[PDB]
Design a protein around this ligand. Structure first.
Ligand SMILES: Nc1nc2c(ncn2[C@@H]2O[C@H](COP(=O)(O)OP(=O)(O)OP(=O)(O)O)[C@@H](O)[C@H]2O)c(=O)[nH]1
Ligand SMILES: [Mg+2]
Lengths: 81, 74, 79, 82, 74, 39, 55, 486, 97, 82
């Protein structure tokens, strides 16, 4: 199991930002993160490629189709590695 | 490993599915496997025109699943 | 709970005519009767057709083995 | 070869062509990367462009990038001491 | 037929005239010499049909598996 | 707290034994796995 | 120099069995409830005597 | 210099960072407030000791007598008994590897000091009830179950001292299963006597029952011991194997599947055959065969010990082997994460029972949201002397708002009502500490949902107090005063 | 495995290495590599000799008004390694003939 | 057989690599690993439709490689022996 993956699981319960492979940007609370990067989130704000926003209560995104995630800066500050 | 996706919470709920190709469908989750292939019942294709057409019970390959959104409360 | 593979096994048994959504190609979809399939979701289709959504034109194929790579979605059609 | 550059500031190139510059803190089998104090650039990687060095820069912060979408990495600057 | 699977179908079609469509829209007609476990494909006396029209007569040809969309007997 | 330790007089008994001084109480796994320390 | 020893467990069980005439048969400490050192210290400080104990 | 406690100035090494603790303390949804309670001498302090040992790498037990880290008085160290409740605040990982902020109140088990338990019950969200595996359900166990249920808390059980079954009573492993099953049944019977309709059934299948041995540092749930099997053999699923390891289920080794019917007449239940049997084999190889065949067994488990470790006597050696086999106590943390609610989701039945003004009000809704920016409402049930004994520091939890050092607050006593206004005081708080047994971490601000040591407010506080802000909140009411078991 | 390299579709590569014969590789980059196979593997990675790379291009609106006419191009590469994913097709036809 | 092993032998050679995204890389190999992840020094890298940039070090994810152009001098028959 990978070092970044452990740090992701650590962000469960925190507000995170996710960009997909298609560039839609989802911000909200990370409920569950699976080993393969599958992500369950809640109370989302989504910002599309045209710039428009929307609001969603509940989402789940497949790990493969995630480009990246932004985690809380405070959480990062792993040391042993 | 050979893990399941954690989707039992979403079983028998109405969902909104974003697929690759800018394709979107809506239906009730009836089941899944470790590849995230889905069974969706009472499925409806949301055509880019805005028009929606009923396609019944269908299989979506997990490969081409970008994102899902619940239309219910879990 | 219905497992996706089983749905297919059902399609197979039923000999329902099937319409397949392909990966990253919207203007064409494939149709046929599933005779058999394998662990990779590779399908053997009978009396198969290319369906051009744009041209409303159908291309007749007969005996097809479609690689599963292309599968986005599997639906049934009354025809 | 990866462990050497750990703790350093690193310029990472994405498959769409973006430039992610952050502190390289962790990696793995897939090359999923952990980037602290990370910013994104789009238009340029400056080599002292007399007009300006920085356009479309965005502050991101603590970033986990998936290796699927990584192309390449070069050393951008030394480790911050902190 | 009583369940006719991918693998046997392809094996029955060895020794036969086939046409393979590739994902990229090229088409290759020829005698199927062999296939392997990954579904790489070997044609003899291959011909190329692009836009459904005879383009090039090519001879003996290996097609990498990931390129294949579908195979047809013909 | 009281050490309730039970002396054994005769060695032919098993080590783990219910002494009459004690008051009476009253999905698939792979083929390789076993209980720990089965040997 | 004969300064340190380490024994195996059959050795210790044989020695323990052979020494039992000189050894106690207590397993815990509660036998010495008001017969421990601290009770004797308190007793000395208060000028009181536990019935078996020193004065 | 009068010195009455074992408290220190130096802050020892930890595995976590301190600002990571301030982070978790802000986050307010990972944290949990647990009270450890039990009968006299059932192993609470040595359990907390086990956790501290795990978290602080250099603080260790002295091989022959235990440090009772949480007993910080010369009277508790001499007299041998817990007298006064002591708070610990640590950061612990789960089986996933996700850390949580645990605020643990170690309470005395002697029945005469049960009032300290009630103080620890007011400030916390759940309770972990420790039970001696040899001794069973005793006097104060029953009394504390009744008291915890009636004070509206979640209950999880840890069955400590399982070595007493193997190394003292020497029961065969099947009869060990029967005795443990007897204990969990009797706790269920006591709850169903006192609790209402509410399904507070405990079973290890439901994951709120913990089997431990705090002397030899063994602690597991069904889940974490399953995870040890999954870590040894790659393709095991964690949870699904966990759901089959208790009860009258059995195993068919030709089918490779768990049956509810026994395959032969002479067969072993799954718990006995997968959990107790290796435990009986580990302890027997250690205490019986350290010289002959402990190296072979340590190889087969994968544990490696150095040459100086094999030269220890049997009790430190056994504690060492079990620390290397069971690792961190993640099964406990899973039990407390899954079944003890957080401050946010637990705040509602707390303000129901606790707050005199009533549940729904501006202050009531404000508390129920548990946000750290609202009005300050802090509630102090405990008061601690300094190491010299001169001045006191109050100990409370923050229910809403945030306390800052130096800021003035109004303190309201038990006899205060709104309309009289006579029984009240204004005081400036000096310093704030995140209390830890032998040392305090000094902080500047403490958010909502957390325990805090407060300097400066002690002089108007007779017994318990509520603390609110001076400007505004003319609608504040004092929390109900402590109701004692006795 | 050798049997599958020897008789399966990859025998095209196996035959080209043994006979030191030329093969044309249609490639994902829209380029074609024409040469001799020194080595190959499962993935169709190859080490190639005497490679003639051929492709086609346009001036790409040299006018400024979207006007160009297609242009063929080629170049010689004596020694090179090809990662096999880029393979579309490998042709064991008689190019020399 | 496993041709990545062959590439792993090419430390201290200078090569030109063409990427899947069209980028061209010329530098001296410091290391190829089992995933064909390639590391170089003294690198002149030309993204398609730019003038070159020089980097002291560059690290490429293996999958992003199209092909390596090897030194004409390279003694392949030696390197193909195991
Ligand atoms: N046999 C055995 N004894 C233990 C174990 N754990 C603790 N003890 C002993 O039990 C006694 C209990 O001491 P503590 O653990 O400090 O007791 P406590 O739980 O804090 O109870 P209080 O005094 O009321 O606070 C001590 O003698 C410990 O040495 C154990 O796992 N096995
Ligand atoms: Mg205690």
């Amino acid at each position: 199991i990978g070092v970044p993956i452990k740090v992701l699981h650590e962000a469960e319960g925190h507000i995170v930002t996710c960009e997909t492979n298609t560039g839609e940007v989802y911000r909200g609370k990370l409920i569950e993160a699976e080993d393969n990067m599958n992500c369950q989130m809640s109370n989302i704000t989504v910002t599309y490629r045209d710039g428009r926003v929307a609001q969603l209560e509940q989402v789940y995104i497949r790990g493969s189709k995630i480009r990246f995630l932004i985690l809380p800066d405070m959480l990062k500050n792993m040391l042993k590695s | 490993k050979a893990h399941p996706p954690e989707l039992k919470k979403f079983m028998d709920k109405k969902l909104s599915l974003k697929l690759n190709g800018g394709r979107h469908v809506q239906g009730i989750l009836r089941g899944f496997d470790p590849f995230m292939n889905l069974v969706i019942d009472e499925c409806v294709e949301m055509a880019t025109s805005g028009q929606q057409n009923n396609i019944g019970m269908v299989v979506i390959r997990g490969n081409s699943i970008i994102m899902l959104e619940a239309l219910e409360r879990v | 709970m219905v497992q996706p593979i089983n749905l297919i096994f059902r399609y197979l048994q039923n000999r329902s005519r099937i319409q397949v959504w392909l990966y990253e190609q919207v203007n064409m979809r494939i149709e046929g009767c599933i005779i058999g399939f394998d662990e990779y979701m590779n399908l053997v289709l009978d009396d198969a057709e290319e369906i051009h959504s744009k041209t409303k034109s159908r291309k007749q194929l007969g005996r097809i083995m479609l690689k599963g790579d292309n599968i986005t979605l599997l639906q049934s059609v009354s025809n | 070869k990866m462990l050497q550059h750990i703790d350093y500031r690193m310029r990472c190139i994405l498959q769409d062509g973006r430039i992610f510059i952050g502190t390289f803190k962790a990696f793995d089998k897939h090359m999923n990367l952990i980037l602290c104090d990370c910013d994104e650039f789009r238009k340029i990687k400056p080599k002292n462009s007399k007009q300006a060095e920085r356009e479309e820069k965005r502050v991101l912060g603590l970033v986990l990038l998936r290796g699927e979408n990584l192309v390449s990495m070069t050393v951008e600057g030394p480790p911050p001491k902190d | 037929s009583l369940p006719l699977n991918p693998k046997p179908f392809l094996n029955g079609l060895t020794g036969k005239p086939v046409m393979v469509k590739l994902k990229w829209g090229m088409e290759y007609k020829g005698y199927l010499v062999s296939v392997d476990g990954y579904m790489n494909m070997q044609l003899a006396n291959t011909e190329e049909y692009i836009d459904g029209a005879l383009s090039g007569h090519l001879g003996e040809v290996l097609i990498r598996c990931n390129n294949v969309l579908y195979i047809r007997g013909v | 707290p009281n050490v309730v330790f039970i002396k054994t007089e005769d060695p032919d008994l098993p080590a783990f034994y219910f002494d009459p001084l004690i008051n009476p109480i009253s999905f698939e796994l792979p083929e390789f796995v076993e209980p720990f320390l089965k040997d | 120099t004969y300064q340190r020893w380490q024994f195996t467990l059959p050795m210790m069980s044989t020695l323990y069995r052979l020494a039992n005439q000189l050894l106690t048969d207590l397993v815990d400490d509660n036998y010495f409830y008001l017969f421990d050192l601290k009770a004797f210290f308190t007793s000395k400080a208060l000028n009181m005597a536990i019935p078996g104990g020193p004065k | 210099t009068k010195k009455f406690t074992l408290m220190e100035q130096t802050l020892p090494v930890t595995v976590y960072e301190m600002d990571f603790l301030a982070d978790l303390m802000d986050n307010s949804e990972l944290i949990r407030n647990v009270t450890l309670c039990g009968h006299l001498h059932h192993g609470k302090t040595c359990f907390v000791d086990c956790l501290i040992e795990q978290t602080h790498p250099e603080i260790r037990k002295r091989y022959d007598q235990d440090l009772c880290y949480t007993d910080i008085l010369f009277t508790e160290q001499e007299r041998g008994v817990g007298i006064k409740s002591t708070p610990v605040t640590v950061v612990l990982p789960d089986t996933k590897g996700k850390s949580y902020l645990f605020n643990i109140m170690d309470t005395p088990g002697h029945v005469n000091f049960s009032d300290e338990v009630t103080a620890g019950l007011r400030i916390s969200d759940g309770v972990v009830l420790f039970i001696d595996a040899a001794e069973g359900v005793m006097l104060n166990t029953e009394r504390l179950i009744k008291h915890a249920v009636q004070e509206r808390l979640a209950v999880t059980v840890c069955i400590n001292k399982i070595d007493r079954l193997i190394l003292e009573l020497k029961l065969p492993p099947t009869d060990a299963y029967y005795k443990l099953r007897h204990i969990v049944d009797e706790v269920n019977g006591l709850i169903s006597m006192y609790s209402t309709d509410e399904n507070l059934i405990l079973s290890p299948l439901l994951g709120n029952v913990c089997f431990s041995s705090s002397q030899y540092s063994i602690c597991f749930t069904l889940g974490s011991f399953a995870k040890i099997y999954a870590d040894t053999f790659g393709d095991i699923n964690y949870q699904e194997f966990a759901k089959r390891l208790w009860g009258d289920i059995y195993f068919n080794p030709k089918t490779r599947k768990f049956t509810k019917k026994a395959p032969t007449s002479s067969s072993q239940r799954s718990f006995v055959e997968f959990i107790l049997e290796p435990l009986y084999k580990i302890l027997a190889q250690v205490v019986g065969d350290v010289d002959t065949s402990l190296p072979r067994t340590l190889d087969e488990l994968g544990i490696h010990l150095t040459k100086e470790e094999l030269k220890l006597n049997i009790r430190p050696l056994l504690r060492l082997v079990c620390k290397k086999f069971f690792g961190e106590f993640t099964g406990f943390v899973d039990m407390c994460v899954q079944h003890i609610p957080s401050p946010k989701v637990g705040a509602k039945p707390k303000i129901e029972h606790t707050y005199t003004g009533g549940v729904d009000s501006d202050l009531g809704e404000a508390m129920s949201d548990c946000d750290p920016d609202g009005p300050l409402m802090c509630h102090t049930t405990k008061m601690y002397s300094t190491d010299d004994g001169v001045q006191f520091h109050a100990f409370g939890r923050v229910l809403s708002g945030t306390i800052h050092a130096g800021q003035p607050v109004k303190v309201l006593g038990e006899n205060y009502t709104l309309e009289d206004e006579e029984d009240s005081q204004i005081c400036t708080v000096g310093r704030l500490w995140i209390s830890v047994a032998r040392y305090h971490i000094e902080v500047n601000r403490v958010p909502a949902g957390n325990w805090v040591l407060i300097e400066g407010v002690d002089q108007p506080i007779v017994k318990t107090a509520t603390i609110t802000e001076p400007r505004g909140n003319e609608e504040a009411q004092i929390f109900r005063p402590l109701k004692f078991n006795t | 495995e050798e049997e599958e390299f020897n008789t399966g579709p990859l025998s095209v590569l196996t035959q080209s290495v043994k006979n030191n014969t030329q093969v044309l590789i249609n490639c994902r980059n829209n380029k074609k590599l024409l040469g001799r196979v020194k080595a190959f593997d499962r993935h169709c990675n190859m080490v190639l000799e005497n490679v003639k790379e051929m492709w086609t291009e346009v001036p790409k609106s040299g006018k400024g008004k979207k006007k160009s006419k297609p242009v063929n191009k080629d170049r010689y590469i004596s020694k090179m390694f090809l990662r096999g994913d880029s393979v579309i097709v490998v042709l064991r036809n008689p190019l020399i003939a | 057989m496993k041709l990545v092993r062959f590439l792993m032998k090419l430390s201290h050679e200078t090569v030109t690599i063409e990427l899947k995204n069209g980028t061209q890389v010329h530098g001296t190999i410091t290391g190829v690993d089992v995933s064909m992840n390639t590391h170089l020094k003294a690198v002149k890298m030309t993204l398609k439709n730019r003038e070159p940039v020089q980097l002291e070090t560059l690290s490429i994810r293996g999958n992003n490689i199209r092909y390596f152009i090897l030194p004409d001098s390279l003694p392949l028959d030696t390197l193909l022996v195991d």
